[PDB]
Design an enzyme around this catalytic site. Structure first.
Site, PDB file in Angstrom:
ATOM      1  N   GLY A  14       0.786  -1.221   0.000  1.00 57.08           N
ATOM      2  CA  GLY A  14       0.000   0.000   0.000  1.00 57.08           C
ATOM      3  C   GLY A  14       0.822   1.277   0.000  1.00 57.08           C
ATOM      4  N   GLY A  17      -3.118   5.529   1.992  1.00 56.89           N
ATOM      5  CA  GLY A  17      -4.540   5.257   2.025  1.00 56.89           C
ATOM      6  C   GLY A  17      -4.880   3.876   2.550  1.00 56.89           C
ATOM      7  CB  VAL A  21      -2.397  -5.001  -1.906  1.00 53.08           C
ATOM      8  CG1 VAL A  21      -2.615  -3.526  -1.883  1.00 53.08           C
ATOM      9  CG2 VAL A  21      -1.157  -5.356  -2.717  1.00 53.08           C
ATOM     10  CD  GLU A  90       0.439 -10.641 -14.514  1.00 53.22           C
ATOM     11  OE1 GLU A  90      -0.261 -10.027 -15.356  1.00 53.22           O
ATOM     12  OE2 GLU A  90       1.335 -11.446 -14.850  1.00 53.22           O
ATOM     13  CG  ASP A 136     -10.543   4.164  -9.887  1.00 57.16           C
ATOM     14  OD1 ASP A 136     -10.701   5.403  -9.816  1.00 57.16           O
ATOM     15  OD2 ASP A 136      -9.827   3.527  -9.087  1.00 57.16           O
TER      16      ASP A 136
HETATM   17  N1  LIG Z   1      -0.127  -6.429  -8.718  1.00 62.37           N
HETATM   18  C1  LIG Z   1       0.472  -5.479  -7.979  1.00 62.37           C
HETATM   19  N2  LIG Z   1       1.825  -5.382  -8.024  1.00 62.37           N
HETATM   20  C2  LIG Z   1       2.495  -4.454  -7.309  1.00 62.37           C
HETATM   21  N3  LIG Z   1       1.841  -3.564  -6.504  1.00 62.37           N
HETATM   22  C3  LIG Z   1       0.471  -3.681  -6.471  1.00 62.37           C
HETATM   23  C4  LIG Z   1      -0.271  -4.630  -7.202  1.00 62.37           C
HETATM   24  N4  LIG Z   1      -1.598  -4.446  -6.921  1.00 62.37           N
HETATM   25  C5  LIG Z   1      -1.697  -3.418  -6.046  1.00 62.37           C
HETATM   26  N5  LIG Z   1      -0.449  -2.927  -5.751  1.00 62.37           N
HETATM   27  C6  LIG Z   1      -0.166  -1.792  -4.813  1.00 62.37           C
HETATM   28  O1  LIG Z   1      -1.199  -1.701  -3.814  1.00 62.37           O
HETATM   29  C7  LIG Z   1      -1.890  -0.436  -3.877  1.00 62.37           C
HETATM   30  C8  LIG Z   1      -3.408  -0.600  -3.760  1.00 62.37           C
HETATM   31  O2  LIG Z   1      -3.965  -1.321  -4.905  1.00 62.37           O
HETATM   32  P1  LIG Z   1      -5.481  -1.322  -5.090  1.00 62.37           P
HETATM   33  O3  LIG Z   1      -5.779  -2.275  -6.266  1.00 62.37           O
HETATM   34  O4  LIG Z   1      -5.816   0.110  -5.519  1.00 62.37           O
HETATM   35  O5  LIG Z   1      -6.336  -1.582  -3.840  1.00 62.37           O
HETATM   36  P2  LIG Z   1      -7.362  -0.667  -3.071  1.00 62.37           P
HETATM   37  O6  LIG Z   1      -7.871  -1.560  -1.903  1.00 62.37           O
HETATM   38  O7  LIG Z   1      -8.552  -0.382  -4.044  1.00 62.37           O
HETATM   39  N6  LIG Z   1      -6.703   0.723  -2.446  1.00 62.37           N
HETATM   40  P3  LIG Z   1      -6.968   2.255  -3.041  1.00 62.37           P
HETATM   41  O8  LIG Z   1      -7.525   2.236  -4.507  1.00 62.37           O
HETATM   42  O9  LIG Z   1      -5.669   3.121  -2.989  1.00 62.37           O
HETATM   43  O10 LIG Z   1      -8.046   2.963  -2.174  1.00 62.37           O
HETATM   44  C9  LIG Z   1      -1.486   0.220  -5.190  1.00 62.37           C
HETATM   45  O11 LIG Z   1      -1.446   1.655  -5.187  1.00 62.37           O
HETATM   46  C10 LIG Z   1      -0.145  -0.427  -5.498  1.00 62.37           C
HETATM   47  O12 LIG Z   1       0.913   0.381  -4.923  1.00 62.37           O
HETATM   48 MG   LIG Z   2      -6.468   2.071  -6.298  1.00 61.69          MG
END
Ligand SMILES: Nc1ncnc2c1ncn2[C@@H]1O[C@H](COP(=O)(O)OP(=O)(O)NP(=O)(O)O)[C@@H](O)[C@H]1O
Ligand SMILES: [Mg+2]
Ligand SMILES: [Mg+2]
EC number: 2.7.11.1
Length: 277
Positions: A14, A17, A21, A90, A136
């Site tokens: 993360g 926020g 993950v 991945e 998004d």
């Molecule tokens: N496959 C991935 N590989 C490397 N980093 C990842 C991957 N997926 C997510 N991340 C990291 O984890 C963060 C959150 O991913 P996200 O899919 O947006 O989840 P979220 O729960 O919706 N959080 P957010 O959208 O910021 O409110 C991202 O900003 C990336 O830095």
């Molecule tokens: Mg996001």
């Protein structure tokens, strides 16, 4: 089989926020993965898997766009727990999201913006081709495989099945929403997606988002804080047309003059990423 016996969980990825993950490793082939946990309580939309299985709309959309086209991160597997669902995505390495990449380097050169923008267009085009609407698109939701110079689309948590009829709900990034939504709370998938693509492009060549307040979004006037070619400015104003019907189709975007002679991912990396400059 459980989960903890397959992947070696690492540090929280993360860093900015909510959301959870972590950085994982797949014991066996030690393949780099990302473990995203989603609380059931905070799950707005649910969808049935091909075999009718109550699951988060995110898992449904990911499996429909998962296969080969590296445009979007693939859902390698998922698990269900009493109060949450775990997703194994991945994870490229090295990697860096567009937002950090922009903050760090500021406005991107047009040649580089062309390769990047093109790649997300191909990825979004791939999503619509699989009946998926992301909802998004934004620098935060795209990753950069720094070695290959390939952008990967992520986070389908606000996604939705692609329909040709109106949408009356939107739980995505405000500043990226179109004037139709802000003014009437209704929009159409493809044309709204083109509008977010317009914000994104601007964000790439200017280093920042064009609009910040509903008023600016509704007015739709675009001011350039940076030297941007006329062609690129034209493509941007075009994607940002107030009236949805006036926005360019994905085909028109990719046929647009500023969009010609795009670099290949590896060339891009070799020129703009590989070099420690
Ligand atoms: N496959 C991935 N590989 C490397 N980093 C990842 C991957 N997926 C997510 N991340 C990291 O984890 C963060 C959150 O991913 P996200 O899919 O947006 O989840 P979220 O729960 O919706 N959080 P957010 O959208 O910021 O409110 C991202 O900003 C990336 O830095
Ligand atoms: Mg996001
Ligand atoms: Mg999300």
């Amino acid at each position: 089989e459980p989960l903890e016996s397959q992947y070696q969980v690492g540090p929280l990825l993360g860093s900015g926020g909510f959301g959870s993950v972590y950085s994982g490793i797949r014991v066996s082939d030690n393949l780099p993965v990302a473990i995203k946990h989603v609380e059931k309580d905070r799950i707005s939309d649910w969808g049935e898997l091909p075999n009718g299985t109550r699951v988060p709309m995110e898992v449904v959309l990911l499996k429909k766009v998962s296969s080969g086209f590296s445009g979007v991160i693939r859902l390698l597997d998922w698990f269900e727990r009493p109060d949450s669902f775990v997703l194994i995505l991945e994870r490229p390495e090295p990697v860096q999201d567009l937002f950090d990449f922009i903050t760090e380097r500021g406005a991107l050169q047009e040649e580089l913006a062309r390769s990047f923008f093109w790649q997300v267009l191909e990825a979004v085009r791939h999503c619509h081709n699989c009946g998926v609407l992301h909802r998004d698109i934004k620098d935060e939701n795209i990753l950069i495989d720094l070695n290959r110079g390939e952008l990967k689309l992520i986070d389908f948590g606000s996604g939705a099945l692609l329909k040709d009829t109106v949408y009356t709900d939107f739980d995505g990034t405000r500043v990226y929403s179109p004037p139709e939504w802000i003014r009437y709370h209704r929009y159409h998938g493809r044309s709204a997606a083109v509008w977010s693509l317009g914000i994104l492009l601007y964000d790439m060549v200017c280093g920042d988002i064009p609009f910040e307040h509903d008023e600016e979004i509704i007015r739709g006037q675009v001011f350039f804080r940076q030297r941007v070619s006329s062609e690129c400015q034209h493509l941007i104003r075009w994607c940002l047309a107030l009236r949805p019907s006036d926005r360019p189709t994905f085909e028109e975007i990719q046929n647009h003059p500023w969009m010609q002679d795009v670099l290949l991912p590896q060339e891009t990396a070799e020129i703009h990423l590989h070099s420690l400059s």
